[PDB]
Amino acid sequence: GKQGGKTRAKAKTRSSRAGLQFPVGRVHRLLRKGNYAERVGAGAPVYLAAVLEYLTAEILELAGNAARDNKKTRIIPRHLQLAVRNDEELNKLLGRVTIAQGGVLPNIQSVLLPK
């Protein structure tokens, strides 16, 4: 009954099916090899992939703006720091994370300014 491994129809990626840019194939795979649970259902990777993609769009939209603000076109780490630290939620989510070469937000305590 191996008459099926031939002509007509032809494949389609799972990211394609989900409507995603991120790798559903790869994500599902990483879930198995990380030993989280015995079994992993099909929807697991689809969801995780949607969430990861979504979050990266959020940081990139925010960072790209920082890029525009400083008249640059290529996002650099400082743009990522600025984006995160300026957003309450991203700041919370990455509150124990240090983005190398990002520096700090410029902020001087009021009582340090002159007369």
Binding site: P77, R96, V97, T98, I99, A100, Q101, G103, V104, N107, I108, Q109, L112
Partner: protein, 87 residues
């Protein structure tokens, strides 16, 4: 003789001006003369802790070379997650 120079007192490579710079980014306007030695001490400890774990990660892998991965893992343990070096 083969090689090797003795490494000692390198804690003083943490120069007064380098620490003063750090404070500035830290938004500090004025500094007491006793801050430089305190800071050195604080840093020595910070480093010993990360290096200890990192090197522990190394010895476990039966290696003689400390990788960025080592440092990165040692830092996640301490709760100091670092992005940018192959996380």
């Amino acid at each position: 003789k083969r090689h090797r120079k003795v490494l000692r007192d390198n804690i003083q490579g943490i120069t007064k001006p380098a620490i003063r710079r750090l404070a500035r980014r830290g938004g500090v306007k004025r500094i007491s003369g006793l801050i430089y030695e305190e800071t050195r001490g604080v840093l020595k400890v910070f480093l010993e802790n990360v290096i200890r774990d990192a090197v522990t990660y190394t010895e476990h892998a039966k290696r003689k070379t400390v990788t960025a991965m080592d440092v990165v893992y040692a830092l996640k343990r301490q709760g100091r997650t670092l992005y940018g070096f192959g996380g």
